[PDB]
């Protein structure tokens, strides 16, 4: 049910975490991946969000908080955490309820706002991304 561009973003996120040997991937990794997803980026530019500043702070936070695998063996692949899974599950079932067939990066962006205590949500608020604006742009513009 995921559209090509969203599948690409998720694959890129996985491939990035493997390159970095990151032990797990949180909702913050997901948001970082969405900053270059056309659907989610378009929604963010419509809100006049400074994507450069947002990306830099998100990247800093990830590197500073994500454990990195030692040159040792075992668990070579990264694992999505409960926040990463919840957000995707939320988007998928919200789209299914809207009668639409495709899940886009923008739908996933809206779902991230529901992870209220996450650093991802904190940074969206910090950078003045109103969920109301995002939702209005999606309902009408897509």
Curated annotation (Swiss-Prot):
Chain segments carrying region Repeat 1: 2-65
Region (Repeat 2): 80-142
Taxonomic superkingdom: Bacteria
Limits of the Clp R domain: 1-142
Biological function: ATP-dependent specificity component of the ClpAP protease. It directs the protease to specific substrates. It has unfoldase activity. The primary function of the ClpA-ClpP complex appears to be the degradation of unfolded or abnormal proteins.
Assembly with partners or alone: Component of the ClpAP complex composed of six ClpA subunits assembled into a hexameric ring in the presence of ATP, and fourteen ClpP subunits arranged in two heptameric rings. Binds to ClpS.
Family: Belongs to the ClpA/ClpB family.
Protein name (record): ATP-dependent Clp protease ATP-binding subunit ClpA
Provenance organism: Escherichia coli (strain K12)
Underlying gene: clpA
């Amino acid at each position: 049910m995921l559209n090509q561009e969203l599948e690409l973003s998720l694959n890129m996120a996985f491939a990035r975490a493997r390159e970095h040997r990151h032990e797990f991937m949180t909702v913050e990794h997901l948001l970082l991946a969405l900053l270059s997803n056309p659907s989610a980026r378009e929604a963010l530019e419509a809100c006049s969000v400074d994507l450069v500043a947002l990306r830099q702070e998100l990247e800093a936070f990830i590197e500073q908080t994500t454990p990195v695998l030692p040159a040792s063996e075992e668990e070579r692949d990264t694992q999505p955490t409960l926040s990463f899974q919840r957000v995707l599950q939320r988007a998928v079932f919200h789209v299914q309820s809207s009668g639409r067939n495709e899940v886009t990066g923008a739908n996933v962006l809206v779902a991230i706002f529901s992870e209220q205590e996450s650093q991802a949500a904190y940074l969206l608020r910090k950078h003045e991304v109103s969920r109301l604006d995002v939702v209005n742009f999606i309902s009408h513009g897509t």
